[PDB]
Structure formats: C-alpha cells, structure tokens
Amino acid sequence: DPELAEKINEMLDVILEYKNEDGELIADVFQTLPTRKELPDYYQVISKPMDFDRINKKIETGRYTVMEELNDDMNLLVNNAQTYNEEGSEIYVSSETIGKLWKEQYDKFM
Amino acid sequence: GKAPR
C-alpha cells in the first residue's frame, strides 16, 4: 500500500539517519547481519534473525499490511541485539537507542 | 562491532 510504505519509509529514515555523540550512524551495524557462513554461532543463539536489509525486502514485496507487523520486526531487531551482545557494549547501547527512537515513531504514527 | 556473550 503506497501510503503505508511512505509512512514506514519516513519513520525508518529517522532511525537510519541518527548519529550518536561520537558521530557514528548507530543503525549501520544493524543493516546487514553477518552471514550464516561468516558467523554460524549467531544463528545458534538467535532463532529469528532480523536486519534492515530484510525489512526493506519486506517493504518492496508488500509484506507489511499494517504498522504492527513492522513494530514486530523492529522489536525483533532490538531484542536480538540485546540477546546476542553484552549489556553495556556499543552495539547493545545502540540497540537501546534504536528501540527508543522506534517507540517515538510508532507512538506518533497513532 | 559485535560483543558476544
């Protein structure tokens, strides 16, 4: 649905453009997971992988019909990072910031 | 930049 897609793209651009105090695009490490060949141990821990590459492919193929489906995928992205990575690590901290940014976008979409 | 447990 083009209207939903455009809303999604506007909300995700907020997250994808955000920089931390150090000038780093916090979302960059969540774009593309290491592959199953590169990092098999990730997949033994994480049963449902999610990244922004997968989210984009779903936008392009009509797999989002309602905003709650994207909310599920963003919660998956965040929760996987916090399952896999140690608390206080840069990647964990970045995931926490993504979670907060997403909830602001989702809460304002309503 | 992963930090596995």
Technique used by the depositors: X-ray
Q: Show residues of chain B in contact with A85, CB under 8 Å.
A: 2-5
CB-CB contact of A107 with A74 (8 Å): no
The enclosing H or E element of A4 equals: helix A2-16
- Residue A66 has a CB neighbour count (10 Å cut-off) of 9
List of chain A residues whose C-beta atoms are within 8 Å of the C-beta of residue B5: 84-86
Tell me, yes or no, if A35 comes closer than 8 A to chain B by beta carbon.
no
Which residue, among A33, A17, A26, has the nearest Cα to A84 in the 3D structure? A33
Number of neighbours of residue A110 by Cβ within 10 angstroms = 5
Buried b (16+ CB within 10 A) or exposed e, A19-30: eeeeeeebbebb
Q: Which amino acid is at A62?
A: G
Phi-psi category of A23—alpha, beta or left, where left has phi over 0 and alpha has psi -120 to 50? Answer: left
Determine whether the interchain pair B1/A41 forms a contact, defined as Cβ–Cβ distance below 8 Å. no
Experimental resolution (Å): 1.3
